[PDB]
Design a binder for these strands. Structure first.
Ligand SMILES: [Mg+2]
Ligand SMILES: [Mg+2]
Ligand SMILES: [Mg+2]
Ligand SMILES: [Mg+2]
Ligand SMILES: [Mg+2]
Ligand SMILES: [Mg+2]
Ligand SMILES: [Mg+2]
Ligand SMILES: [Mg+2]
Ligand SMILES: [Mg+2]
Ligand SMILES: [Mg+2]
Ligand SMILES: [Mg+2]
Ligand SMILES: [Mg+2]
Ligand SMILES: [Mg+2]
Ligand SMILES: [Mg+2]
Ligand SMILES: [Mg+2]
Ligand SMILES: [Mg+2]
Ligand SMILES: [Mg+2]
Ligand SMILES: [Mg+2]
Ligand SMILES: [Mg+2]
Ligand SMILES: [Mg+2]
Ligand SMILES: [Mg+2]
Ligand SMILES: [Mg+2]
Ligand SMILES: [Mg+2]
Ligand SMILES: [Mg+2]
Ligand SMILES: [Mg+2]
Ligand SMILES: [Mg+2]
Ligand SMILES: [Mg+2]
Ligand SMILES: [Mg+2]
Ligand SMILES: [Mg+2]
Ligand SMILES: [Mg+2]
Ligand SMILES: [Mg+2]
Ligand SMILES: [Mg+2]
Ligand SMILES: [Mg+2]
Ligand SMILES: [Mg+2]
Ligand SMILES: [Mg+2]
Ligand SMILES: [Mg+2]
Ligand SMILES: [Mg+2]
Ligand SMILES: [Mg+2]
Ligand SMILES: [Mg+2]
Ligand SMILES: [Mg+2]
Ligand SMILES: [Mg+2]
Ligand SMILES: [Mg+2]
Ligand SMILES: [Mg+2]
Ligand SMILES: [Mg+2]
Ligand SMILES: [Mg+2]
Ligand SMILES: [Mg+2]
Ligand SMILES: [Mg+2]
Ligand SMILES: [Mg+2]
Ligand SMILES: [Mg+2]
Ligand SMILES: [Mg+2]
Ligand SMILES: [Mg+2]
Lengths: 117, 54, 141, 48, 150, 103, 109
RNA sequence: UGUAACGGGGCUAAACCAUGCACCGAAGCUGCGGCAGCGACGCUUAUGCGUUGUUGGGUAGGGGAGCGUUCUGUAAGCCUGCGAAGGUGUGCUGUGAGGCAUGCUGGAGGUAUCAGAAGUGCGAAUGCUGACAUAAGUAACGAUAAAGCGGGUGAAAAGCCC
RNA sequence: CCCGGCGAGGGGAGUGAAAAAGAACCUGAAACCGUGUACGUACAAGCAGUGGGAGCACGCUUAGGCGUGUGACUGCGUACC
């Protein structure tokens, strides 16, 4: 009987402050604005995971297109030639190869052209 | 005419930045008394340009 | 892990192009591509990996259709009635260097990075430059 | 068999329904009364 | 709550909340919405249920071997030392004693012992029968318990 | 030299002696794993591209350890609809070391 | 070393920092003349605590005078006496008699 | 109000009507790992030990399972001045409410497991009390009858005395 | 004992296990206001976060590289009931 709620509330607010560490203004000092910020951060990350996936996908595609155009072929033609040659290498490794080992990418585009034409 | 949103400590400090103080650039020394007084003013004893007026 | 570009170790080359007999919409796009670095495998969204491009004979740019009389360039000074209107021929006759710059700025992304990319375009109005010390390479469109 | 080892049966001691003590329990602000009705007011209930 | 049934301020005009009484639980030093009243928590247990519980407790004590039977348990003087020595030689420290006839000397000896309690066959309680580590029961109490239960 | 393989839907490029994080494998903490579904091997201007796999490319790895990944917090929230939901997650991972690569 | 404090003073927590911020890192010889020739009331209050710190350093630690330097100084808020200022139409205005806690730390270096 | 009836740059196609082959393109579908429910089947149940299929957006609302706090019995038991409760940080852990260990301050009570009873969990109600910010060192310093100077006391005077 | 108005207040000495237990006195959190250190910021537009991420400072480094703090730049994103 007569349960006081001081320590529980203090811990529950200190956890929110710890989560909201590094924010600007009241978002890192009070509880009323911090809760609206930590909740808004989870909602952002829940979408930004898929957004990171899409951004990395389109960056790998852009790098592959750049390397293909430097070699003398288009990105769509390169992908079509790879699929007709029935290889299974992915965009991330293709972009990494184009960045680091360029002669390997030249061999890949030659293989694609041989199967395409 | 009253505010609608609470200002911030950053804006308060930016406003107060121009409310600082400027110290004395340098002091003057009497030729014979060797004291330190303000420019073009007299000392605490009554000396000015070496002469005595008090 | 995905490779990223570092502004300190990245290299930039100098290219020179003549805008004689080519179109704005098919030259400024290539300029924007080579300024954003989409022609290099080291392309990154947040790093300016592009090359310094110099443009010569900007007054000799060729435009088809009736755009030389119907191509207006609206802008606003900031005042209530501060609206101005020009045309392609007036722009060429008065400030010819500001006909490629508008197109390239519109095509480039808007922001500090876009402004940094735009800072590399040395657009001139003649057939000579003063950047021969950089040893530029001639480029075709 | 002691006071610290004695337990009741299963399914006999039900917890109980608490109204307006959270959002995750299912009985939120309304507490099973609805939105702005005679049935959702303090002492508001039609007779039999 | 000792106070006055007067509105601290009028309904409108003032730019504060609505006040109708100072004794409001929302305010400070006010009343309680669901203030408690003296209530009786005594539940109801059927006679058959109580007897069955006692039978189960006794049968479980027999299985756990924490219940013993002695034909005669008494102390010749109302002194605690004699009872303490009698329990020590039988190796009992936390024990309950049940007797058919109340012995004044035994009761006086067990009064000053925390882990020793002397009870009649009629006054037994399941809580004590469970709590006490050991239980001792004479025949004169076993027969009375059998007659009470059956 | 380096090689490209796949384990768990994803693909990984790795050289000799490097450590790789993969999905939870039903292997012990000191055993050896053979990857035969290799895709490419490059050793300094002698490349071999599989169609789709290489004829004899094999990757030998030692399972260094297992574990669980970094904590992930999941928050769902509906504006003015009286709905919020909290969740936690930790993905199981297996760390291995590439002992050898053969063509 | 050899701190000096003045607590429960009669001033504001903002009007003293303006003169406190111009003697940070300065020598005692310059800090005293600047305070004497400063035309603010807080100058006297800061000079009193500076003299107390100098005297305490010279009497307790045996420090010199020409070697001293004001290596630290800060003023914090204190209790605020609450008073009412009469206002029209039967209103009231809570005015707070501000105080300050001035602290100076002078090191030998 | 300022282009202002392609989103913009710009386009004589980078526009439209017709053919085809590629690519991009979603929390849609496939691959890997992980959690939970329902139903089938042999688990002779350990009520779960393998399968297999399927499902798992969600307001009002219904059902089910749980976390945390006070007190009571277990408890004249256990921890604790070789440092308790509480406060402030770190690390680890669980799907979750949370839990565990410990550094420092703190300086004397706290309480395992299993059960029981609730003043049992706050962000809002122009909610109440207390404290502290903001506007801000801004207005104002309360009849525009008026003050100036020379001496005195005092650490210091325009305002105290002559 | 000294500064200071024979003050207020504080620094020394002393008692006390403890004086950031000194009478505004057990424990002393939060809002709020200060000092010191690391990083970023004066061509830059918006619920101020999130994903990616250069650089900088510190401490371990089995030199591998990670961690903590800062977060130029960039995609997305108009608080709660
Ligand atoms: Mg930050
Ligand atoms: Mg803080
Ligand atoms: Mg592919
Ligand atoms: Mg408004
Ligand atoms: Mg100002
Ligand atoms: Mg954009
Ligand atoms: Mg009830
Ligand atoms: Mg509901
Ligand atoms: Mg309502
Ligand atoms: Mg309605
Ligand atoms: Mg209704
Ligand atoms: Mg009513
Ligand atoms: Mg009346
Ligand atoms: Mg009262
Ligand atoms: Mg009361
Ligand atoms: Mg009866
Ligand atoms: Mg108009
Ligand atoms: Mg996708
Ligand atoms: Mg799906
Ligand atoms: Mg699966
Ligand atoms: Mg559901
Ligand atoms: Mg679904
Ligand atoms: Mg109590
Ligand atoms: Mg208890
Ligand atoms: Mg301790
Ligand atoms: Mg307690
Ligand atoms: Mg604690
Ligand atoms: Mg503790
Ligand atoms: Mg208990
Ligand atoms: Mg309550
Ligand atoms: Mg509150
Ligand atoms: Mg208000
Ligand atoms: Mg409120
Ligand atoms: Mg102010
Ligand atoms: Mg003024
Ligand atoms: Mg103003
Ligand atoms: Mg003014
Ligand atoms: Mg004024
Ligand atoms: Mg005035
Ligand atoms: Mg007056
Ligand atoms: Mg006046
Ligand atoms: Mg006078
Ligand atoms: Mg006067
Ligand atoms: Mg004193
Ligand atoms: Mg005490
Ligand atoms: Mg205290
Ligand atoms: Mg604090
Ligand atoms: Mg800048
Ligand atoms: Mg702005
Ligand atoms: Mg990151
Ligand atoms: Mg609410």
């Amino acid at each position: 009987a007569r349960v006081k709620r001081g320590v529980i509330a203090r811990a529950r607010h200190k956890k929110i402050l710890k989560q909201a560490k590094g924010y600007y203004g009241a978002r890192s000092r009070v509880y009323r604005v911090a809760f609206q910020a930590v909740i808004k951060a989870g909602q952002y990350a829940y979408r930004d995971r898929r957004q990171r996936k899409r951004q990395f996908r389109q960056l790998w595609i852009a790098r592959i297109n750049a390397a293909a155009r430097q070699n003398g072929i288009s990105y769509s033609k390169f992908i079509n030639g790879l699929k007709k040659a029935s290889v299974e290498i992915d965009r991330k490794i293709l972009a990494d190869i184009a960045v680091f080992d360029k002669v390997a990418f030249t061999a890949l585009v030659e293989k694609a052209k041989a199967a395409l034409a | 005419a009253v505010q609608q949103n609470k200002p911030t400590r950053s804006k308060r400090g930016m406003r107060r930045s121009h409310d600082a103080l400027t110290a004395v650039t340098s002091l003057s020394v009497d030729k014979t008394s060797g004291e330190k007084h303000l420019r073009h003013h007299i000392t605490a004893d009554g000396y000015y340009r070496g002469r005595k007026v008090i | 892990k995905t490779f990223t570009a570092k502004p300190e170790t990245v290299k930039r080359d100098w290219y020179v192009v003549d805008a004689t007999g080519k179109t704005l919409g098919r030259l400024a796009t290539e300029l924007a591509r080579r300024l954003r670095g989409k022609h290099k495998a080291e392309y990154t969204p947040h790093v300016d990996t592009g090359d310094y491009i110099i443009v010569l004979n900007a007054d000799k740019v060729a435009v088809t259709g009736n755009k030389r009389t119907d191509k207006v360039y609206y802008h606003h000074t900031g005042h209530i009635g501060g609206i101005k209107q020009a045309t392609f021929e007036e722009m060429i006759a008065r400030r010819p260097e500001r006909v490629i710059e508008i197109a390239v700025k519109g095509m480039l992304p808007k922001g500090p990075l876009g402004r940094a990319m735009f800072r590399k375009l040395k657009v001139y109005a003649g057939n000579e430059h003063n950047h021969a010390a950089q040893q530029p390479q001639v480029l075709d469109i | 068999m002691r006071l610290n080892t004695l337990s009741p049966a299963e399914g006999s001691k039900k917890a109980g329904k608490r109204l307006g003590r959270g959002i995750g329990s299912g009985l939120g602000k309304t507490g099973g009364r609805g939105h702005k009705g005679q049935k959702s007011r303090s002492g508001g209930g039609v007779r039999r | 709550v000792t106070g006055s049934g007067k509105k601290p301020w009028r309904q409108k005009g003032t730019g504060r909340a609505r006040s109708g009484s100072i004794k409001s639980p929302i305010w400070r030093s006010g009343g309680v919405t669901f203030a408690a009243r003296p209530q009786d928590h005594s539940q109801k247990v059927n006679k058959k249920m109580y007897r069955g519980a006692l039978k189960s407790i006794l049968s479980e004590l027999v299985r756990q071997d924490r219940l013993i039977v002695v034909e005669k348990f008494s102390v010749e003087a109302p002194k605690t030392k004699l009872l303490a020595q009698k329990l020590k030689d039988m190796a009992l420290e936390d024990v309950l004693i049940i007797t058919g006839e109340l012995d004044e000397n035994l009761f006086l000896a067990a009064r000053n012992l925390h882990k020793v309690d002397v009870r009649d066959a009629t006054g037994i309680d399941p809580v004590s029968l469970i709590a006490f580590d050991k239980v001792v029961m004479t025949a004169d109490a076993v027969k009375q318990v059998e007659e009470m239960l059956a | 030299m380096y090689a490209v393989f796949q384990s768990g839907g994803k693909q990984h490029r790795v050289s000799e002696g490097q450590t790789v994080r993969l999905e939870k494998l039903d292997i012990a903490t000191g055993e050896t794993v053979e990857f035969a579904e290799v895709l490419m091997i490059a050793n300094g201007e002698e490349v071999k591209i599989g169609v789709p796999f290489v004829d004899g490319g094999v990757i030998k790895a030692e399972v260094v350890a297992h574990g669980r990944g970094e904590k992930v917090k999941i928050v769902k929230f509906r504006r003015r609809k009286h709905y919020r939901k909290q969740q936690g997650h930790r993905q199981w991972f297996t760390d291995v070391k590439i002992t050898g690569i053969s063509a | 070393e050899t701190i000096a404090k003045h607590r429960h003073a009669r001033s504001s927590a903002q009007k003293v920092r303006l003169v406190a911020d111009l003697i940070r890192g300065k020598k005692v010889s310059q800090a005293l003349d600047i305070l004497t020739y400063t035309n603010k009331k807080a100058a006297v209050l800061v000079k009193k605590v500076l003299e107390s710190a100098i005297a305490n350093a010279e009497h307790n630690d045996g420090a010199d005078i020409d070697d001293l330097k004001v290596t630290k100084i800060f003023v914090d808020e204190g209790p605020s006496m609450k008073r009412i200022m009469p206002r029209a139409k039967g209103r009231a205005d809570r005015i707070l008699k501000r105080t300050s806690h001035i602290t100076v730390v002078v090191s030998d270096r």
